[PDB]
Design a protein that fits this description.
3 strands; monomer; 2 helices; alpha+beta; Rubredoxin-like
């Protein structure tokens, strides 16, 4: 057996600009000065779903991306 161990999970995070716009950024990269991390960090699909909401309390309108494929 090999000891490499397959763990190909590339994580991202949601970043917000001073214009309160929501974008995605890889976890492994430093954020450009002027933005900050917000929401949840995780897979790209997590980030996609999040921005769709973009916050949600009444209804996750990411449901409209279920018409596309799977909200991710």
């Amino acid at each position: 057996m090999t000891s490499v161990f397959d763990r190909d999970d590339i994580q991202f995070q949601v970043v917000v600009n001073h214009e309160e716009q929501y974008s995605i950024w890889p976890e492994y990269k430093e954020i450009p000065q002027g933005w900050r991390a917000a929401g949840k960090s995780g897979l790209k699909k997590d980030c996609l779903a999040y921005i769709e909401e973009v916050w949600t309390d009444m209804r996750p309108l990411s449901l409209r991306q279920h018409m596309d494929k799977a909200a991710g």
